[PDB]
Amino acid sequence: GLIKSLAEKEKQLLERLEAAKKEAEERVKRAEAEAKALLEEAEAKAKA
Amino acid sequence: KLEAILSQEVEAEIQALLQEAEAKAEAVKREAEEKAKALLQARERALEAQYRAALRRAESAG
Amino acid sequence: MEKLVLAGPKGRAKELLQSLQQAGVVHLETLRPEALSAYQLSPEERAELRRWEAVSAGAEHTLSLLGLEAEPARPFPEGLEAAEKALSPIQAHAEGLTRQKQELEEELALAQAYLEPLERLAALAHGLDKSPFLRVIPFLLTEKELPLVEEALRKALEDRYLLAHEAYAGGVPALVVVHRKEVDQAKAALSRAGVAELRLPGALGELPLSEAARRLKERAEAAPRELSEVRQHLAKLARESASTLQSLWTRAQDEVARLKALEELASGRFGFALLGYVPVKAKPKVEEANPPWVKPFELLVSFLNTPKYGTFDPTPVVPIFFPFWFGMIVGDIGYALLFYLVGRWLSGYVKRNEPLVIDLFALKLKPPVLAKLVYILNWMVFWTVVWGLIYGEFFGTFLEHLGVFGTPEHPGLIPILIHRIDTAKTANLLILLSVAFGVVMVFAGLILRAYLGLKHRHMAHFWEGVGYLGGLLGILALAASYLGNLQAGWLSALMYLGFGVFLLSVVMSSIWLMIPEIFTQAGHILSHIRIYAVGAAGGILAGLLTDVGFAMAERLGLIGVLLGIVVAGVLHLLILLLTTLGHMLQPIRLIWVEFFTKFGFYEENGRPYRPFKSVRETQ
């Protein structure tokens, strides 16, 4: 009858899940950038 | 009613997960610091040997 | 808050919602079936359900073995772990005891049969059954077979065979003893007559006769004593722990039902569905939210509240039943008089039956729970017998009198000589008085029948239902022209012509493709008249059998007749009961002409909801 109930939880649930994907991606990217950059210094220092 | 709130019971499980993987994004970095570090302990000792060796040779030559 | 899930039908969406809304549950929102999908049980949930079934079944298994099964309404909340740990020692112990018991019983059954033959046979060739030099073969022969067998063996085996027999009370167990290597020949001879070798089951059969015979005698003596013990240990275990199993059974069953509920709701198998929320406090509160007339009415209120069609309350039924039902009892000499006594045995208690124990604690032929339900019924019977005693003096208006009829209140020879309900004028009016109620019921069903199509908003039912009621008027009209002739009923001889127009004139407005079938609508009218007539007249007939059962049917009547008639009277009682119980089914037979033909009633050819017969079973 009321379509309103089932619509408005579905599209709040969809946002919760997308927002889970967001902070998972925005983290793995970072961790690799940090590790890349640590070792760059370890090459910069090693030769010097 | 729980509707908007219905979604915060998931956002709390799926926040538990995301913290468990920011407890692995710390562990990974620990091991990688302990790796990067050890590659320069080997760098330190091997050079030290080659400097002990270079002055000893140059003394026997002298 | 606790999340709660609700279902109902589409038809009652508003009525269900209003009721739930009131009950405790708050924040009710509707959910369509596409929303319910994707909330089917996860594999873990299905494993709990599988396991809950095992516990349910597993109890039924243990509890049946141990003795009798009983299903209470008392569960005991426990874990998966707690319920399975409860169940495992008792099922094991009981399984073990029943197995011994079966072996003990089979052994007895064989040993009881075959001890006497093996004793006889062993005796005949004593100490020669374990020799290699001689071969023995046991076999049974009847008196009839013995000569044939002997001939056959004698020709086959010459005169160097030994045929011996010894009796046992009936036939003879016979033994033929033959040389080793003459075995095949010996066998062949038995086989041609159709007689074959006797060998028992297991080790005994294979043992020498002498061993087998000694051991069988021992088993018959030992078994009955050990059987007694195993049966005793098993009885104690039931006695102490039959309850434990029963309480697991109930609890386990509730959990199975809950998880099944969620799988059905999940596949979108309930059309109207709600979600709402209850605080922990509200959770109980949701589940929480003259005797003859009042008493059945208060239980019927549960059916007031759930309608299903354009139908009205199923409650007009009960006061139509009661006058007509009481008036099937009309005796006063050994019919209603005897029947008074019957009432007390169902509304009190007896022990004069075996399957029935004491009713006061709810123990009858009927299941113990069903017996507690039919207290109400038993009362409604008690009220019928009581009122029938009054309508037995109503009958005695038409019998007893000291001047109007030729039979006193109690003659001094024997009570009741000749019935005086054989006056022609007297029988006709009691039949015509009875007919009047049947007519009242014809109007009441078809008037509701029309109101049904008005508020169910199908004009085809409205139009058909109105028209058929015109025919009643014609039916009665026509009768008056014959009951009063032209002295009375010349006041309806001209309305009848027009009454006939009304029967057809409204029915045709719906059209209808079987106009003849209207004949059968007129059939239903006719029945209410005939059944009420049968209800009086057949009721009165009940009394007139009692003429020859507790009334003068010996000599000219005298002092001796009083205690002489009772020979025929007792024989007459069971005969009398059977035909008068046949009349008491008329109230329901009447009701069903109208009830299942949707005359302000729920039913109409099938459809869920019980016949009133089954409703009134408990009420």
PDB file of all heavy atoms in Angstrom, chain C residues 541-603, unseen atoms left out:
ATOM      1  N   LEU C 541     -44.611 -38.941  18.017  1.00  0.00           N
ATOM      2  CA  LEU C 541     -44.372 -40.359  17.647  1.00  0.00           C
ATOM      3  C   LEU C 541     -43.384 -41.016  18.631  1.00  0.00           C
ATOM      4  O   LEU C 541     -43.478 -42.195  19.030  1.00  0.00           O
ATOM      5  N   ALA C 542     -42.377 -40.288  19.030  1.00  0.00           N
ATOM      6  CA  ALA C 542     -41.394 -40.711  20.044  1.00  0.00           C
ATOM      7  C   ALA C 542     -42.073 -41.217  21.316  1.00  0.00           C
ATOM      8  O   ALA C 542     -41.783 -42.313  21.826  1.00  0.00           O
ATOM      9  N   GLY C 543     -43.138 -40.470  21.777  1.00  0.00           N
ATOM     10  CA  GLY C 543     -44.025 -40.700  22.909  1.00  0.00           C
ATOM     11  C   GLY C 543     -44.969 -41.862  22.729  1.00  0.00           C
ATOM     12  O   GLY C 543     -45.319 -42.576  23.660  1.00  0.00           O
ATOM     13  N   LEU C 544     -45.308 -42.064  21.433  1.00  0.00           N
ATOM     14  CA  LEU C 544     -46.372 -43.029  21.172  1.00  0.00           C
ATOM     15  C   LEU C 544     -45.703 -44.415  21.063  1.00  0.00           C
ATOM     16  O   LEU C 544     -46.364 -45.408  20.919  1.00  0.00           O
ATOM     17  N   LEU C 545     -44.303 -44.528  21.092  1.00  0.00           N
ATOM     18  CA  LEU C 545     -43.581 -45.816  21.102  1.00  0.00           C
ATOM     19  C   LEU C 545     -43.521 -46.353  22.491  1.00  0.00           C
ATOM     20  O   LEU C 545     -43.431 -47.601  22.663  1.00  0.00           O
ATOM     21  N   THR C 546     -43.578 -45.383  23.474  1.00  0.00           N
ATOM     22  CA  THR C 546     -43.528 -45.541  24.885  1.00  0.00           C
ATOM     23  C   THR C 546     -44.792 -46.146  25.463  1.00  0.00           C
ATOM     24  O   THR C 546     -44.819 -46.628  26.574  1.00  0.00           O
ATOM     25  N   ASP C 547     -45.817 -46.348  24.581  1.00  0.00           N
ATOM     26  CA  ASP C 547     -47.125 -47.026  24.801  1.00  0.00           C
ATOM     27  C   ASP C 547     -46.941 -48.426  25.211  1.00  0.00           C
ATOM     28  O   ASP C 547     -47.607 -48.967  26.058  1.00  0.00           O
ATOM     29  N   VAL C 548     -46.015 -49.071  24.435  1.00  0.00           N
ATOM     30  CA  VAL C 548     -45.801 -50.462  24.546  1.00  0.00           C
ATOM     31  C   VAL C 548     -44.442 -50.706  25.290  1.00  0.00           C
ATOM     32  O   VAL C 548     -43.957 -51.854  25.134  1.00  0.00           O
ATOM     33  N   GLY C 549     -43.873 -49.709  26.053  1.00  0.00           N
ATOM     34  CA  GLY C 549     -42.567 -49.797  26.678  1.00  0.00           C
ATOM     35  C   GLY C 549     -42.670 -49.480  28.161  1.00  0.00           C
ATOM     36  O   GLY C 549     -41.909 -50.015  28.926  1.00  0.00           O
ATOM     37  N   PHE C 550     -43.589 -48.548  28.520  1.00  0.00           N
ATOM     38  CA  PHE C 550     -43.876 -48.261  29.931  1.00  0.00           C
ATOM     39  C   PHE C 550     -45.318 -47.833  30.028  1.00  0.00           C
ATOM     40  O   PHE C 550     -45.695 -46.866  30.688  1.00  0.00           O
ATOM     41  N   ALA C 551     -46.239 -48.574  29.360  1.00  0.00           N
ATOM     42  CA  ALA C 551     -47.655 -48.295  29.361  1.00  0.00           C
ATOM     43  C   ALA C 551     -48.267 -49.616  28.930  1.00  0.00           C
ATOM     44  O   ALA C 551     -47.578 -50.437  28.305  1.00  0.00           O
ATOM     45  N   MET C 552     -49.548 -49.777  29.185  1.00  0.00           N
ATOM     46  CA  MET C 552     -50.361 -51.002  29.123  1.00  0.00           C
ATOM     47  C   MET C 552     -50.223 -51.635  27.770  1.00  0.00           C
ATOM     48  O   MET C 552     -50.544 -51.029  26.798  1.00  0.00           O
ATOM     49  N   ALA C 553     -49.646 -52.874  27.787  1.00  0.00           N
ATOM     50  CA  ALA C 553     -49.423 -53.593  26.575  1.00  0.00           C
ATOM     51  C   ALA C 553     -49.405 -55.017  27.123  1.00  0.00           C
ATOM     52  O   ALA C 553     -48.942 -55.912  26.444  1.00  0.00           O
ATOM     53  N   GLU C 554     -50.021 -55.226  28.306  1.00  0.00           N
ATOM     54  CA  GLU C 554     -50.213 -56.595  28.799  1.00  0.00           C
ATOM     55  C   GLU C 554     -51.537 -56.565  29.467  1.00  0.00           C
ATOM     56  O   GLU C 554     -51.944 -55.585  29.989  1.00  0.00           O
ATOM     57  N   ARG C 555     -52.243 -57.683  29.417  1.00  0.00           N
ATOM     58  CA  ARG C 555     -53.589 -57.999  29.920  1.00  0.00           C
ATOM     59  C   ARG C 555     -54.606 -56.917  29.531  1.00  0.00           C
ATOM     60  O   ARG C 555     -54.661 -56.513  28.361  1.00  0.00           O
ATOM     61  N   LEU C 556     -55.475 -56.509  30.451  1.00  0.00           N
ATOM     62  CA  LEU C 556     -56.391 -55.363  30.274  1.00  0.00           C
ATOM     63  C   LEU C 556     -55.793 -54.238  31.049  1.00  0.00           C
ATOM     64  O   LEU C 556     -56.515 -53.252  31.290  1.00  0.00           O
ATOM     65  N   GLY C 557     -54.558 -54.391  31.575  1.00  0.00           N
ATOM     66  CA  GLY C 557     -53.962 -53.470  32.577  1.00  0.00           C
ATOM     67  C   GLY C 557     -54.401 -53.937  33.926  1.00  0.00           C
ATOM     68  O   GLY C 557     -55.546 -54.407  34.135  1.00  0.00           O
ATOM     69  N   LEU C 558     -53.451 -53.858  34.907  1.00  0.00           N
ATOM     70  CA  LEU C 558     -53.714 -54.470  36.221  1.00  0.00           C
ATOM     71  C   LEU C 558     -52.497 -54.046  36.981  1.00  0.00           C
ATOM     72  O   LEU C 558     -51.694 -53.294  36.475  1.00  0.00           O
ATOM     73  N   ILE C 559     -52.422 -54.489  38.291  1.00  0.00           N
ATOM     74  CA  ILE C 559     -51.274 -54.133  39.141  1.00  0.00           C
ATOM     75  C   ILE C 559     -49.887 -54.686  38.633  1.00  0.00           C
ATOM     76  O   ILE C 559     -48.898 -53.973  38.689  1.00  0.00           O
ATOM     77  N   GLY C 560     -49.920 -55.897  38.146  1.00  0.00           N
ATOM     78  CA  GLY C 560     -48.761 -56.765  37.648  1.00  0.00           C
ATOM     79  C   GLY C 560     -48.141 -56.163  36.424  1.00  0.00           C
ATOM     80  O   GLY C 560     -46.964 -56.438  36.134  1.00  0.00           O
ATOM     81  N   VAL C 561     -48.919 -55.390  35.579  1.00  0.00           N
ATOM     82  CA  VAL C 561     -48.502 -54.847  34.331  1.00  0.00           C
ATOM     83  C   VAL C 561     -47.391 -53.869  34.574  1.00  0.00           C
ATOM     84  O   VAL C 561     -46.422 -53.838  33.767  1.00  0.00           O
ATOM     85  N   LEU C 562     -47.393 -53.083  35.671  1.00  0.00           N
ATOM     86  CA  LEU C 562     -46.383 -52.126  36.061  1.00  0.00           C
ATOM     87  C   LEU C 562     -44.924 -52.656  36.010  1.00  0.00           C
ATOM     88  O   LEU C 562     -44.041 -52.042  35.492  1.00  0.00           O
ATOM     89  N   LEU C 563     -44.707 -53.902  36.533  1.00  0.00           N
ATOM     90  CA  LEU C 563     -43.426 -54.486  36.661  1.00  0.00           C
ATOM     91  C   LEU C 563     -43.241 -55.560  35.641  1.00  0.00           C
ATOM     92  O   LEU C 563     -42.224 -56.296  35.660  1.00  0.00           O
ATOM     93  N   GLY C 564     -44.158 -55.822  34.657  1.00  0.00           N
ATOM     94  CA  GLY C 564     -44.112 -56.791  33.618  1.00  0.00           C
ATOM     95  C   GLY C 564     -43.660 -56.171  32.302  1.00  0.00           C
ATOM     96  O   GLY C 564     -42.941 -56.799  31.483  1.00  0.00           O
ATOM     97  N   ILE C 565     -44.069 -54.876  32.058  1.00  0.00           N
ATOM     98  CA  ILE C 565     -43.861 -54.081  30.802  1.00  0.00           C
ATOM     99  C   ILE C 565     -42.400 -53.760  30.588  1.00  0.00           C
ATOM    100  O   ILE C 565     -41.941 -53.588  29.462  1.00  0.00           O
ATOM    101  N   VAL C 566     -41.605 -53.694  31.717  1.00  0.00           N
ATOM    102  CA  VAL C 566     -40.171 -53.337  31.793  1.00  0.00           C
ATOM    103  C   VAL C 566     -39.238 -54.350  31.093  1.00  0.00           C
ATOM    104  O   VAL C 566     -38.111 -54.044  30.611  1.00  0.00           O
ATOM    105  N   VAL C 567     -39.818 -55.597  30.881  1.00  0.00           N
ATOM    106  CA  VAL C 567     -39.171 -56.563  29.976  1.00  0.00           C
ATOM    107  C   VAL C 567     -38.940 -55.958  28.620  1.00  0.00           C
ATOM    108  O   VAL C 567     -37.869 -56.090  28.090  1.00  0.00           O
ATOM    109  N   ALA C 568     -39.986 -55.258  28.058  1.00  0.00           N
ATOM    110  CA  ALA C 568     -39.941 -54.775  26.704  1.00  0.00           C
ATOM    111  C   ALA C 568     -39.364 -53.360  26.730  1.00  0.00           C
ATOM    112  O   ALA C 568     -38.601 -53.073  25.795  1.00  0.00           O
ATOM    113  N   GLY C 569     -39.594 -52.688  27.875  1.00  0.00           N
ATOM    114  CA  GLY C 569     -39.167 -51.335  27.991  1.00  0.00           C
ATOM    115  C   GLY C 569     -37.697 -51.070  27.797  1.00  0.00           C
ATOM    116  O   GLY C 569     -37.385 -50.081  27.113  1.00  0.00           O
ATOM    117  N   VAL C 570     -36.762 -51.906  28.417  1.00  0.00           N
ATOM    118  CA  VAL C 570     -35.309 -51.795  28.387  1.00  0.00           C
ATOM    119  C   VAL C 570     -34.887 -52.058  26.996  1.00  0.00           C
ATOM    120  O   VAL C 570     -33.969 -51.487  26.471  1.00  0.00           O
ATOM    121  N   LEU C 571     -35.514 -53.108  26.266  1.00  0.00           N
ATOM    122  CA  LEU C 571     -35.131 -53.496  24.959  1.00  0.00           C
ATOM    123  C   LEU C 571     -35.446 -52.357  24.036  1.00  0.00           C
ATOM    124  O   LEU C 571     -34.683 -51.908  23.205  1.00  0.00           O
ATOM    125  N   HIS C 572     -36.583 -51.712  24.357  1.00  0.00           N
ATOM    126  CA  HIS C 572     -37.067 -50.559  23.651  1.00  0.00           C
ATOM    127  C   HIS C 572     -36.216 -49.281  23.752  1.00  0.00           C
ATOM    128  O   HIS C 572     -36.206 -48.526  22.798  1.00  0.00           O
ATOM    129  N   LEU C 573     -35.413 -49.149  24.841  1.00  0.00           N
ATOM    130  CA  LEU C 573     -34.666 -47.900  25.157  1.00  0.00           C
ATOM    131  C   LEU C 573     -33.632 -47.517  24.076  1.00  0.00           C
ATOM    132  O   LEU C 573     -33.479 -46.343  23.738  1.00  0.00           O
ATOM    133  N   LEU C 574     -32.901 -48.504  23.562  1.00  0.00           N
ATOM    134  CA  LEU C 574     -31.765 -48.270  22.653  1.00  0.00           C
ATOM    135  C   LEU C 574     -32.368 -48.030  21.307  1.00  0.00           C
ATOM    136  O   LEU C 574     -31.935 -47.108  20.640  1.00  0.00           O
ATOM    137  N   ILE C 575     -33.470 -48.731  20.921  1.00  0.00           N
ATOM    138  CA  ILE C 575     -34.197 -48.496  19.772  1.00  0.00           C
ATOM    139  C   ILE C 575     -34.739 -47.073  19.729  1.00  0.00           C
ATOM    140  O   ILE C 575     -34.643 -46.458  18.610  1.00  0.00           O
ATOM    141  N   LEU C 576     -35.309 -46.563  20.845  1.00  0.00           N
ATOM    142  CA  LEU C 576     -35.964 -45.290  21.033  1.00  0.00           C
ATOM    143  C   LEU C 576     -34.916 -44.255  20.851  1.00  0.00           C
ATOM    144  O   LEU C 576     -35.075 -43.259  20.067  1.00  0.00           O
ATOM    145  N   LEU C 577     -33.744 -44.365  21.496  1.00  0.00           N
ATOM    146  CA  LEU C 577     -32.676 -43.366  21.498  1.00  0.00           C
ATOM    147  C   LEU C 577     -32.264 -43.070  20.048  1.00  0.00           C
ATOM    148  O   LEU C 577     -32.114 -41.912  19.658  1.00  0.00           O
ATOM    149  N   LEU C 578     -32.041 -44.113  19.280  1.00  0.00           N
ATOM    150  CA  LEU C 578     -31.505 -44.033  17.911  1.00  0.00           C
ATOM    151  C   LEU C 578     -32.356 -43.280  16.966  1.00  0.00           C
ATOM    152  O   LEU C 578     -31.976 -42.468  16.146  1.00  0.00           O
ATOM    153  N   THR C 579     -33.657 -43.412  17.178  1.00  0.00           N
ATOM    154  CA  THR C 579     -34.594 -42.638  16.288  1.00  0.00           C
ATOM    155  C   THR C 579     -34.885 -41.245  16.719  1.00  0.00           C
ATOM    156  O   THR C 579     -35.360 -40.503  15.827  1.00  0.00           O
ATOM    157  N   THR C 580     -34.592 -40.894  18.004  1.00  0.00           N
ATOM    158  CA  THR C 580     -34.921 -39.609  18.465  1.00  0.00           C
ATOM    159  C   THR C 580     -33.793 -38.620  18.378  1.00  0.00           C
ATOM    160  O   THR C 580     -34.079 -37.433  18.258  1.00  0.00           O
ATOM    161  N   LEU C 581     -32.570 -39.135  18.339  1.00  0.00           N
ATOM    162  CA  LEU C 581     -31.295 -38.507  18.048  1.00  0.00           C
ATOM    163  C   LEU C 581     -31.329 -38.122  16.593  1.00  0.00           C
ATOM    164  O   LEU C 581     -30.683 -37.109  16.243  1.00  0.00           O
ATOM    165  N   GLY C 582     -32.085 -38.879  15.745  1.00  0.00           N
ATOM    166  CA  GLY C 582     -32.271 -38.604  14.415  1.00  0.00           C
ATOM    167  C   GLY C 582     -33.032 -37.358  14.120  1.00  0.00           C
ATOM    168  O   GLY C 582     -32.811 -36.606  13.184  1.00  0.00           O
ATOM    169  N   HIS C 583     -33.925 -36.987  15.108  1.00  0.00           N
ATOM    170  CA  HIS C 583     -34.707 -35.802  15.027  1.00  0.00           C
ATOM    171  C   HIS C 583     -33.903 -34.577  15.435  1.00  0.00           C
ATOM    172  O   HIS C 583     -34.235 -33.478  14.949  1.00  0.00           O
ATOM    173  N   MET C 584     -32.878 -34.794  16.338  1.00  0.00           N
ATOM    174  CA  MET C 584     -32.178 -33.684  16.960  1.00  0.00           C
ATOM    175  C   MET C 584     -31.152 -33.033  16.005  1.00  0.00           C
ATOM    176  O   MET C 584     -30.674 -31.900  16.315  1.00  0.00           O
ATOM    177  N   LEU C 585     -30.896 -33.724  14.848  1.00  0.00           N
ATOM    178  CA  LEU C 585     -30.077 -33.407  13.736  1.00  0.00           C
ATOM    179  C   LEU C 585     -30.925 -32.550  12.822  1.00  0.00           C
ATOM    180  O   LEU C 585     -30.401 -31.909  11.919  1.00  0.00           O
ATOM    181  N   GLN C 586     -32.308 -32.413  12.988  1.00  0.00           N
ATOM    182  CA  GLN C 586     -33.108 -31.587  12.175  1.00  0.00           C
ATOM    183  C   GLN C 586     -32.817 -30.105  12.319  1.00  0.00           C
ATOM    184  O   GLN C 586     -32.770 -29.517  11.264  1.00  0.00           O
ATOM    185  N   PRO C 587     -32.579 -29.481  13.478  1.00  0.00           N
ATOM    186  CA  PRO C 587     -32.232 -28.137  13.688  1.00  0.00           C
ATOM    187  C   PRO C 587     -31.069 -27.775  12.806  1.00  0.00           C
ATOM    188  O   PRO C 587     -31.064 -26.755  12.119  1.00  0.00           O
ATOM    189  N   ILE C 588     -29.929 -28.666  12.737  1.00  0.00           N
ATOM    190  CA  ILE C 588     -28.776 -28.346  11.972  1.00  0.00           C
ATOM    191  C   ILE C 588     -28.996 -28.532  10.508  1.00  0.00           C
ATOM    192  O   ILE C 588     -28.494 -27.798   9.647  1.00  0.00           O
ATOM    193  N   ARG C 589     -29.848 -29.535  10.185  1.00  0.00           N
ATOM    194  CA  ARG C 589     -30.268 -29.858   8.749  1.00  0.00           C
ATOM    195  C   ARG C 589     -31.058 -28.703   8.133  1.00  0.00           C
ATOM    196  O   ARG C 589     -30.874 -28.325   6.983  1.00  0.00           O
ATOM    197  N   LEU C 590     -31.947 -28.101   8.975  1.00  0.00           N
ATOM    198  CA  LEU C 590     -32.652 -26.852   8.710  1.00  0.00           C
ATOM    199  C   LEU C 590     -31.735 -25.686   8.489  1.00  0.00           C
ATOM    200  O   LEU C 590     -31.822 -24.973   7.492  1.00  0.00           O
ATOM    201  N   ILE C 591     -30.759 -25.501   9.410  1.00  0.00           N
ATOM    202  CA  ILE C 591     -29.861 -24.364   9.431  1.00  0.00           C
ATOM    203  C   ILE C 591     -29.056 -24.361   8.117  1.00  0.00           C
ATOM    204  O   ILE C 591     -28.979 -23.275   7.482  1.00  0.00           O
ATOM    205  N   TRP C 592     -28.518 -25.600   7.708  1.00  0.00           N
ATOM    206  CA  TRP C 592     -27.702 -25.699   6.569  1.00  0.00           C
ATOM    207  C   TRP C 592     -28.371 -25.378   5.205  1.00  0.00           C
ATOM    208  O   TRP C 592     -27.720 -25.171   4.178  1.00  0.00           O
ATOM    209  N   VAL C 593     -29.756 -25.384   5.127  1.00  0.00           N
ATOM    210  CA  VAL C 593     -30.539 -25.068   3.907  1.00  0.00           C
ATOM    211  C   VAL C 593     -30.233 -23.577   3.616  1.00  0.00           C
ATOM    212  O   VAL C 593     -30.116 -23.217   2.468  1.00  0.00           O
ATOM    213  N   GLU C 594     -30.062 -22.758   4.636  1.00  0.00           N
ATOM    214  CA  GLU C 594     -29.983 -21.377   4.555  1.00  0.00           C
ATOM    215  C   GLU C 594     -28.537 -20.914   4.682  1.00  0.00           C
ATOM    216  O   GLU C 594     -28.122 -20.097   3.887  1.00  0.00           O
ATOM    217  N   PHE C 595     -27.742 -21.520   5.585  1.00  0.00           N
ATOM    218  CA  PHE C 595     -26.413 -21.130   5.995  1.00  0.00           C
ATOM    219  C   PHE C 595     -25.461 -21.268   4.856  1.00  0.00           C
ATOM    220  O   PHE C 595     -24.557 -20.473   4.703  1.00  0.00           O
ATOM    221  N   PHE C 596     -25.495 -22.410   4.047  1.00  0.00           N
ATOM    222  CA  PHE C 596     -24.527 -22.724   3.066  1.00  0.00           C
ATOM    223  C   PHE C 596     -25.024 -22.224   1.723  1.00  0.00           C
ATOM    224  O   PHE C 596     -24.521 -22.638   0.680  1.00  0.00           O
ATOM    225  N   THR C 597     -26.017 -21.323   1.686  1.00  0.00           N
ATOM    226  CA  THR C 597     -26.716 -20.834   0.552  1.00  0.00           C
ATOM    227  C   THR C 597     -26.774 -19.353   0.690  1.00  0.00           C
ATOM    228  O   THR C 597     -27.301 -18.695  -0.185  1.00  0.00           O
ATOM    229  N   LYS C 598     -26.048 -18.852   1.768  1.00  0.00           N
ATOM    230  CA  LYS C 598     -25.470 -17.480   1.840  1.00  0.00           C
ATOM    231  C   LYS C 598     -26.639 -16.524   2.100  1.00  0.00           C
ATOM    232  O   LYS C 598     -26.795 -15.471   1.578  1.00  0.00           O
ATOM    233  N   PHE C 599     -27.408 -16.964   3.099  1.00  0.00           N
ATOM    234  CA  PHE C 599     -28.656 -16.243   3.544  1.00  0.00           C
ATOM    235  C   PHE C 599     -28.382 -15.410   4.779  1.00  0.00           C
ATOM    236  O   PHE C 599     -28.934 -15.701   5.820  1.00  0.00           O
ATOM    237  N   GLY C 600     -27.378 -14.494   4.629  1.00  0.00           N
ATOM    238  CA  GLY C 600     -26.938 -13.662   5.621  1.00  0.00           C
ATOM    239  C   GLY C 600     -25.879 -14.361   6.335  1.00  0.00           C
ATOM    240  O   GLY C 600     -25.574 -13.873   7.395  1.00  0.00           O
ATOM    241  N   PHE C 601     -25.260 -15.394   5.738  1.00  0.00           N
ATOM    242  CA  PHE C 601     -24.288 -16.274   6.361  1.00  0.00           C
ATOM    243  C   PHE C 601     -23.078 -16.357   5.423  1.00  0.00           C
ATOM    244  O   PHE C 601     -23.169 -15.816   4.271  1.00  0.00           O
ATOM    245  N   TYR C 602     -21.906 -16.794   5.955  1.00  0.00           N
ATOM    246  CA  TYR C 602     -20.556 -16.716   5.423  1.00  0.00           C
ATOM    247  C   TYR C 602     -20.437 -17.710   4.296  1.00  0.00           C
ATOM    248  O   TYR C 602     -19.896 -17.483   3.220  1.00  0.00           O
ATOM    249  N   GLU C 603     -20.852 -18.937   4.545  1.00  0.00           N
ATOM    250  CA  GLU C 603     -20.724 -20.004   3.558  1.00  0.00           C
ATOM    251  C   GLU C 603     -21.481 -19.925   2.339  1.00  0.00           C
ATOM    252  O   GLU C 603     -22.466 -19.243   2.351  1.00  0.00           O
TER     253      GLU C 603
END
